[PDB]
Amino acid sequence: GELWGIHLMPPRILVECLLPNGMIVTLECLREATLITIKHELFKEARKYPLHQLLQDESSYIFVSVTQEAEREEFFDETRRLCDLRLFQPFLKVIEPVGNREEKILNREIGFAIGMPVCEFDMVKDPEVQDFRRNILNVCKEAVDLRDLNSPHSRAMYVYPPNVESSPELPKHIYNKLDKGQIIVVIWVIVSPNNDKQKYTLKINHDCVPEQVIAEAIRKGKYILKVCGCDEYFLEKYPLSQYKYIRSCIMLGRMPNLMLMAKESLYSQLPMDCFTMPSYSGETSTKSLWVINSALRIKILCATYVNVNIRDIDKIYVRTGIYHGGEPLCDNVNTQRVPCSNPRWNEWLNYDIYIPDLPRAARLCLSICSVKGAKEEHCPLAWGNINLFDYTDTLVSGKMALNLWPVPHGLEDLLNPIGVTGSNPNKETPCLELEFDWFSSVVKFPDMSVIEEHANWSVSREARLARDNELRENDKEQLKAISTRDPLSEITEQEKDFLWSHRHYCVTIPEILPKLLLSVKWNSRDEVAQMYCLVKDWPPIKPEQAMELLDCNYPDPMVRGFAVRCLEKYLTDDKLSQYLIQLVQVLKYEQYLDNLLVRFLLKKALTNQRIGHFFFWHLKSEMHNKTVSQRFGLLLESYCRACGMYLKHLNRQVEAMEKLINLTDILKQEKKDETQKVQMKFLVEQMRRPDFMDALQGFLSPLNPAHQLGNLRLEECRIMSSAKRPLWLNWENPDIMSELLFQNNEIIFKNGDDLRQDMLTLQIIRIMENIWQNQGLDLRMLPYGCLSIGDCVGLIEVVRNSHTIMQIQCNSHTLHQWLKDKNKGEIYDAAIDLFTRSCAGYCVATFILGIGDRHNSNIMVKDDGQLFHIDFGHFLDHKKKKFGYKRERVPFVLTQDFLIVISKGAQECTKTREFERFQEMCYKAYLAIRQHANLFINLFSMMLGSGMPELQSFDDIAYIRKTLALDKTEQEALEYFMKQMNDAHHGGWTTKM
Amino acid sequence: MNNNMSLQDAEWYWGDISREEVNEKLRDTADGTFLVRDASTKMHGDYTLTLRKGGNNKLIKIFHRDGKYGFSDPLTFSSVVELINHYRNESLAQYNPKLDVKLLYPVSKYQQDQVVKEDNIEAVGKKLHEYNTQFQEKSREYDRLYEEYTRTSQEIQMKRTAIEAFNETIKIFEEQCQTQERYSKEYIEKFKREGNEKEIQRIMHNYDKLKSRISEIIDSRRRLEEDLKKQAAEYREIDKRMNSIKPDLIQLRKTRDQYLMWLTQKGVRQKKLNEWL
Ligand SMILES: Oc1cc(NCc2ccc(F)cc2)cc(-c2nc(N3CCOCC3)c3sccc3n2)c1
């Protein structure tokens, strides 16, 4: 709401105006009024009250009040109306302003974008936080100097980057759709202020450069090509087919409509933004870690309290363990079992590990656990993780207090080593007191030069060794056989000893690095020192393989540092945008706030506004989550400070969503028992108001920032049937060439349900599609837009001309009859082809991922024949629990209704040429995803710390291993897939016989 | 007797179960806890020995060549039972000094047989339906408590900020008293002389109105602190209720899993299982 306890104050309200003479003037206000309007009415009435003579003119003063987030905000922008101020209570203090006015407006705008004040970061004691804020500005200034180097073309490249594919080469089936390798393209040109349009139809090669397309248009330096409908430009000199708009038009079979526009006109429209550096920009005895001759021991002093029922629980205790990522470095140690009434221990727990053998990324994972014929169930009450070494390579010492976190929903593990490190900011919380040893004031982890020194010394005692012995053929084949194992396929102890024995030979097959790293004794400084040297000069690998080394099982700084440098060299901005969801979630696994990955992502976010858009929203969506609020908030502060003019565009988006949150909260809470018609009246009445009309019109779509959302078609806006009250919203496309692409932009707003699962599922579908198109299979999937923007707050893209199955049906032949009418004539074959190809990809895609059961409302069909799915509520068969099946179910079962459409009105739909042709497409598609199984496992492994119930552990990710059948042979996996389709179809799915 | 036992009848042999099913059984188990399964049909080797050591699962492949089994060449054991029972009575330090541990605790496939003593299939099938309904009851009960747990945690966080927002307001309203007390002393003292009580009547009326608002705002902040302690007690109360259901959810799941595991044996039809579940 806009006022604490309320949502909106109806115009007639009183406000306590506090003057600098001492008086308190009550004043009648309206909700629409601006500050200079109220300040005119205040100083009008101020003369009645005493001590008027010492008051100055209105122009010298400024309003001040407390906001919803407890900040003393100074309202410089006096055009801001009263309901948009976000006040705590209706009062307004006038004073004379001080300090840097340019900084204070920027800090409030950054604070509004992030969702918390910038002053909250200033009050942080932790030096890691303040070092981050200072040091990260090095990347920010490096980013702006990059995009201002080749100005003003590089200025335009930041704001309007070329949305292109990774590789310029076309697949064969894409190239064959062109006429002798040429596309027919139309370039529109505006005539004058009169606003008439004239087209220039061209016919050119698919690999032409935008400059050469402009050279052909002038027949039919100065100009640049803009996409009609979007705010998307072809500035860079790529092949014309490499752009996603042109590549889509070839597949869809549409005329690409470009707009001729002046280069001087766009360059002048750019902001030419600024980046000001903010205002915050006895001797110690240092001992080395490897000098300490002592085993690790940690004292658990006491736990303050824990929410336990004394009757139901038998005992409580403190479980602890030393962890390198997910792997325990030694045996987990527990405290003595004490009563729930008095949680107190005071005992030195001895861990079987030598302090020098502790690796750089070693972590103390701990929890308070409850206990319940000599059988007992152990359960976690609260959890917490501490990094043994801090961000400056210093080992922890002395006493420290750790406020523990609530256990995540569904986590039955006693410890949570995957979760974030650091104390809970909420102090009204279970607090475990513990004490580490104190040897010196500062115990440091050694430098790389010292590690190399020990590494050479280590291999010397073991019995140029790379080329001393000769690598045999039997050994060379085994290295290939081990590299073919998927990430979660566990290497054996023979294979670990083999991989380590041939660690020097492993450089010849550099994709074996993740297998080689799992073979290292991380509880042994000898082997880690030797691995550090190999990792230093390791041959670089393909970005998709390097993303494995950023998951929770690879916490070492050197291993991660290598992985980030592979992305710097070989990750395209296409594939960065593709995999951005997973790379943002990976930041949760990082030990420290400052790291090589966040610097890489922040630089790419500030040199590419398309990447920076989603980088903002993926971070902003999780700001409610206190496990990552500080990390993500500080990171957003870096972006919002340095991103330039786009912060103003983001605030218009942020303000638009918050107003849609306010109305849907009222509908869910206050209008719960009202009818949907009366709710629509209330909705329309509030949306009609000017503060809502200004906020919810003239801003960029969060689903795609190229899409401009103009005026609301408020009559066509609706509330949906669900109990969470989703809003079916409808905007005009205000672009001058809208009709060629699309006139109206429809988005389903949503406040109750979680859309991270659909966002992931739709990302995976897009990747699955991209694998098939590259391989040769033309299986048209429809990964529609879906972005999560908050705590169960998200947007969904509406597909035009899309109908559910139950709409068409409400007899088995009804679906085939509808599709024949919509595609009546000689274009019937293309519609059945598209339907069959669409069915195949979604039949395979849903089986692998294990999405919720497909009914007629979940399945949808388009006019052209493209089938697609909606509502991926759960996945990886999350409802295997709440039940007891080990079976891999088939969600999308093709009934008689669907088989008739593939078979073209045949009686025996399961025994035709078209169905057998359909079967082969599913088999080729299934094996295509099986061959890229590592990519998907890596992508899911990066999401384990996200907080989704469906992805908490490696047990949950193992569903795709069962459906793809990675432990089995390729042929056995295909025979498995055939049997699963046969069981679901009750014999209808024909066997190889 | 021991070595002459068949590999099928051995308690520690589990057949073609997945590596995930092995990970479930060895989760939070003691050192030397082990079982044997079939090897991956992609990879070389016949069986896989998974055992615990240092809180970690250790996969050791058992190969075969010409009537002999073992971990590496040369293969010296007659059967897999001879290989296992040898390392049940002797350390694996013989094979590899790294993992100095014996095969102490076999994870039996007759483990469920100890718990579910009832022989009849239909009787066990009925208890699975009963245990599943008791599990689903407490599952829906737990979800309802977690819905409250999140909603309560949110509203506490809304209130916690609002308390600080009240305190900033009170600081400003008390700064307004300081603003009055500062500039009123000079003007009231000039007007106490000259016999102008009409001036003091308006100023002291305005001063009382300021203190009246401070009293109300401090009362509103005081009333909010009672709602915070009230709602914080609900958070603690809900967390106690969930931590009592937590262990019941594990046992009801684990027991039902054993009853399902028992019916996985003796080839019970999938149709019957879904009707019971
Ligand atoms: O990614 C998703 C998730 C969910 N689940 C939530 C939900 C549940 C009930 C409900 F009535 C609406 C939404 C729904 C949709 C979803 N999408 C729809 N689409 C309209 C056509 O374009 C694609 C999106 C429609 S049209 C009528 C219902 C509906 N639901 C998409």
Numbering used by the authors:
A (entry chain A): 8 to 227, 248 to 308, 320 to 410, 414 to 504, 516 to 862, 873 to 1055
B (entry chain B): 322 to 598
Task: List sentences quoted exactly from the publication behind this structure.
Phosphatidylinositol 3-kinases (PI3Ks) are lipid kinases that play pivotal roles in a multitude of fundamental biological processes, including proliferation, survival, differentiation, and metabolism. Among the different PI3K subfamily proteins, PI3Kα is the most important isoform in cell proliferation in response to growth factor-tyrosine kinase pathway activation. Therefore, PI3Kα is a potential target for anti-cancer drug development.
Here, we determined the crystal structure of PI3Kα in complex with the potential inhibitor YXY-4F. The final resolution was 2.97 Å, and the Rwork/Rfree value was 23.1/28.0. The structure maintained all five p110α domains and a long p85 SH2 domain in an overall triangular shape. The crystal structure of PI3Kα–YXY-4F verified that the compound YXY-4F bound to the ATP-binding pocket of the p110α kinase catalytic domain. The morpholino oxygen accepted a hydrogen bond from the amide of the hinge Val851 residue. The fluorine in the phenyl moiety also accepted a hydrogen bond from the Ser773 hydroxyl group. The hydroxyl group in the phenol moiety formed two H-bonds with the Asp810 carboxyl side chain and Tyr836 hydroxyl group. Additionally, van der Waals interactions from the surrounding hydrophobic residues, including Val850, Ile932, Ile848 and Pro778, significantly contributed to YXY-4F’s affinity. Other interactions, including a divalent sulfur and π system, were also observed between the thienopyrimidine moiety and residue Trp780. Ser773 also moved to accommodate the distance between the phenyl fluorine and the Ser773 hydroxyl group to form a hydrogen bond. Collectively, these data suggested a significant shift in the conformation of Ser773 and Ser774 when compound YXY-4F was bound to PI3Kα, which indicated that the p110α residues Ser773 and Ser774 in the ATP binding site induced the pocket to adopt a different shape after YXY-4F binding.
